[PDB]
């Protein structure tokens, strides 16, 4: 079962009984369809990458620099077989943005919900249900491994908040370094974040100097409205994108459909995606799709003009001749003035800051490593052998301190968290793209918009900010900007007993230790993981752990970072 009333003119209707107004967190289309995918990870040394430049190593999903798309319809069940044929590295496949409702075992977080799949052809078949529709991506959680090429896309078909004719498809944008993920982890352990060596466009790159590589083409059909699925799968860079000659109508933020909001330029934090509509009401010519940067505290590239080519049907095979206008500095901040079509509502008029709901982000500049990120006084450092689920599926509640477990006992109530971005640090404060596993959150509010490099600090003040907090259907998504030198307020509803990572999606920072682990409804969760139903999941879990704990001691390399 796919659509039965989903047409160019009526995108809001999907099938009888489901549409763009249907609360997807309650009613899910029962389609008796399952879809299977296979993903095979290989490793390649001394390889020639997208832009002709030698890469000392890369790790590829299905022999390409970018993994395939996991496609399916809202409601279908999904089984994805990850085969790890890497030489030495373990792996954890995470399905970013998936709610994993009551399905923690398949989240894909090593040391948290699973043991890493061993190299040399060890595997696991991840099973899960599409209880959402929209655009996302998947990627390794095994250290910074995805920055080596272990990344890919998701696209579950569903309704839309705005009609359109063509659906171009996913459009992954991802920063590109000639250095390897492990060299960059080692580099940033005592150096600031480097710029990218290039930007990829849906799995392609063109070199600034040698003019090698190639421009990526997107074709437009004069007049017809198109839908573009933009993903930022980077490890660091936050992209400002724009299309010369055209505006872009937002109709989805992350896995959440939203009321049509048109923009001229759009800011993409790491992990964020947006679904824009593009009306091709322009002259049959060629138009730059530009990548630009704001404050360098959230990225830059050695490629000063990365772009792709959007071409009208009938247009020649020339290049765009209009270099476009100047793009405004989005100051390392994603826009919040977006209205979800399915509405939510939390009380905000009652928020009172205290230890039990406040997460303090800090950078310990000490020694070995020089740069270390900590939350609430602790750097997270999971154990690839003994995952939190283990402590849960047994009586042991003696979790290690470095697992930074934040327990939440509230049963299906709203829960408020104020993240503070190192406010007493006079020397530095960086923007962080915060991501929650297992939930979408409402973005209740954040400190006043600032230019990061101006160093303007903001601590939470009840007298100024409570009037600015929004509890009546804010933006809700899985990624949002913690402001530089500021603070962010968030809420999710503990409706999914599990252990959920809450971390920074900058590979360098989360390797540095910038994460906590929400142990949500441990009582309910244990009963779940142990129930008859889960036998096949718990047994697989237990199985992949056995082969990893056995392999581990044969590994020639140590664990250099937190593991995440
Ligand atoms: C980034 O790079 C990737 C490549 O990795 C590229 O992805 C390619 O994306 C496109 C668009 O997302 C994919 O094209 C579509 O495939 C679906 C489903 O395919 C399945 O079914 C067919 C049936 O034989 C099988 O062959 C196939 O193997 C799959 O099982 C189709 O449904 C799509 O066709 C629809 O849209 C087309 C126009 O885009 C129409 O020609 C076609 O008639 C269909 O339109 C219909 O659907 C509408 C509903 O919305 C309906 O209202 C209309 O009336 C009509 O019924 C299309 O073929 C492609 O498979 C991807 N994979 C590749 C090529 O590797 C991205 O495109 C790229 N990103 C950008 C932006 O460049
Ligand atoms: C969008 O990208 C295009 C192509 O990369 C940019 O075109 C360049 O413009 C700069 C201006 O300094 C020139 O130095 C380059 O020679 C141009 N390259 C080409 C191929 O023409 C364009 O500048 C970009 N537009 C925006 C808004 O950033
Ligand atoms: C995962 O694979 C990569 C490639 O082997 C490992 O990175 C190498 O590891 C050593 C020891 O840490 C480094 O000194 C080298 O710089 C790395 N090689 C390159 C070219 O990047 C990494 O250590 C492996 N992780 C595991 C699971 O051991
Ligand atoms: C885009 O078109 C150019 C020339 O028209 C071609 O060289 C290039 O390979 C194309 N890009 C893709 C995605 O193949
Ligand atoms: C894009 O929007 C801006 C203002 O939002 C306006 O200047 C411009 O005319 C618009 N262009 C098109 C083609 O929609
Ligand atoms: C931060 O740590 C303090 C003291 O260890 C603890 O009381 C509090 O619960 C922590 N805050 C959060 C958000 O867990
Ligand atoms: Cu992710
Ligand atoms: Cu995630
Ligand atoms: Cu960070
Ligand atoms: Cu994560």
Characteristic terms for this protein:
binds a molecule of 2 linked components (NAG-NAG); mainly beta; Immunoglobulin-like; monomeric; binds copper (II) ion; Cupredoxin fold; 3 domains; about 575 residues; Copper binding; binds 2-acetamido-2-deoxy-beta-D-glucopyranose; 6-stranded mixed sheet; Beta barrel; oxidoreductase; binds a molecule of 6 linked components (NAG-NAG-BMA-MAN-MAN-MAN)
Folded structure, characterized:
There is one protein chain. By secondary structure, the chain is mostly beta strands. It has 6 helices and 32 strands. A hairpin with a 5-residue loop joins strand 3 and strand 4. A molecule of 2 linked components (NAG-NAG) binds next to strand 4 and helix 1.
Which ligands accompany this protein?
Answer: a molecule of 6 linked components (NAG-NAG-BMA-MAN-MAN-MAN), a molecule of 2 linked components (NAG-NAG), 2-acetamido-2-deoxy-beta-D-glucopyranose, copper (II) ion
Helix content: under 10%
End-to-end gap:
37 Å
CATH fold-level topology of the largest domain: Immunoglobulin-like
- Strand arrangement, major sheet: 12-11-14-19-16-17
Rg from alpha-carbon coordinates:
22 Å
Number of DSSP E strands = 32
- Estimated structural class: mainly beta
For the sheet with most strands, the description reads: 6 strands, mixed
Strand content: 35-45%
CATH architecture of the largest domain: Sandwich
* Whole-number count of domains: 3
CATH superfamily of the largest domain: Cupredoxins -  blue copper proteins
Sum up the overall morphology in one term: globular
The top-level CATH class of the largest domain is: Mainly Beta
Q: Helical segment tally?
A: 6
